[PDB]
Ligand SMILES: Cc1n[nH]c(C)c1-c1cccc2cccnc12
Ligand SMILES: Cc1n[nH]c(C)c1-c1cccc2cccnc12
Ligand SMILES: [Ca+2]
Ligand SMILES: [Ca+2]
């Protein structure tokens with residue numbers, strides 16, 4: 353619904369599957385794992401998702417480790433003010449980029 | 455210098471000048487560690503020293519919100535926040551590079567064995 | 569079908585709508601404009617899209633100009649060997665990133 | 671130096687060392703212009719001179735394919751290819767920064783008025 357996360361792997365050129373994503377609000381707010389498409393839907397509802405400051409934390413360290421690759425970061429963490437959001441994240445072992453589509 | 459940060463601005467085509475950078479450390483058991491502002495080349499040298507930079511989990515937070523607001527631009531992110539374990543197999547030098555846009559950032563690390 | 573392009577704007581946090589995308593093969597091969605979602609489907613067919621070397625050129629200069637913003641690049645150009653492809657591009661006035669999902 | 675290129679490797683956490691960079695120029699009417707390889711810091715200074723770097727449309731191509739293949743990694747892109755108009759309102763200095771991964775790259779420009 354109102355909040356979606358999508359994660360891609362820049363080394364293998366694939367979606368990042370079964371990655372843990374935790375969302376906090378300024379406080380745990382929503383969480384899940386990415387699908388076979390790298391996407392995570394169903395995180396929250398329009399009633400629950402009010403304006404405020406949110407942190408999306410993607411567990412990139414566990415992802416790389418599962419592949420046998422040593423990663424730099426503990427996570428990709430993404431902190432923004434909410435005022436239809438997709439958080440996109442593009443992962444490499446020593447880098448990440450992230451954007452918001454609103 | 456064991457921890458350097460370099461920040462560029464994708465909207466202006468320039469270094470990101472005078473952007474605040476805060477570093478925190480999480481101990482084996484989330485403490486302020488060091489902070490500074492980027493120079494006219496967008497670089498921040500002198501945050502810390504070999505003697506102070508111990509093993510741990512470090513968070514580097516770049517104050518993107520203040521930077522964009524001071525330029526008259528609408529920032530999405532509160533800050534850009536790079537979290538990594540440092541020095542776990544021995545002392546290393548770390549450069550944290552960040553490229554900023556109002557609704558996106560990218561960051562990478564360069565790690566060298568002194 | 570086999571080739572899709574998606575374009576996002578990192579300054580406004582929106583899809584990049586009505587952007588011209590030209591695809592070449594090593595020679596014009598396919599082209600179109602992005603939709604309201606920043607997406608361009610229907611570029612080619614599975615019969616047409618053989619293994620080879622392709623260039624996706626996104627007309628980022630015309631996009632920024634339409635918004636009243638002076639851009640650095642003439643285009644975002646993306647050259648790869650084909651051997652289900654999404655080319656994703658994330659645009660700012662002086663920067664772009666691009667990835668492939670295969 | 672009016673045209674500098676800096677390249678980092680997102681897989682290894684290092685500069686991208688000894689990567690070939692070719693520059694071409696399109697005239698008012700797609701000519702080789704200059705070329706070099708990145709240093710041990712991932713930087714390429716000395717591509718050109720004030721006197722040679724005229725107005726025009728320039729293409730900087732970074733040979734990502736050779737670089738990844740030499741490291742035993744599967745590259746998607748043939749090369750990373752930055753195309754821009756230069757010097758149109760007067761001489762400027764340009765830094766082209768690129769961050770490489772096997773299936774992705776990002777690039778930005780820093781533009782300064784000497
Ligand atoms: C976040 C990001 N960085 N560089 C690029 C390219 C992207 C990107 C662009 C377009 C669609 C996407 C979907 C998921 C993940 N990332 C993306
Ligand atoms: C972190 C990052 N994302 N996309 C690119 C391009 C860079 C980059 C590459 C090379 C040198 C740099 C120096 C400072 C900041 N960023 C960079
Ligand atoms: Ca909940
Ligand atoms: Ca200063």
Ligand SMILES: [Ca+2]
Nearest residue numbers: 509541542543
């Ligand atoms: Ca240790």
Ligand SMILES: [Ca+2]
Nearest residue numbers: 596597598599
């Ligand atoms: Ca065709």
Ligand SMILES: [Ca+2]
Nearest residue numbers: 707708709710
């Ligand atoms: Ca050298």
Ligand SMILES: [Ca+2]
Nearest residue numbers: 725757758759
């Ligand atoms: Ca002119």
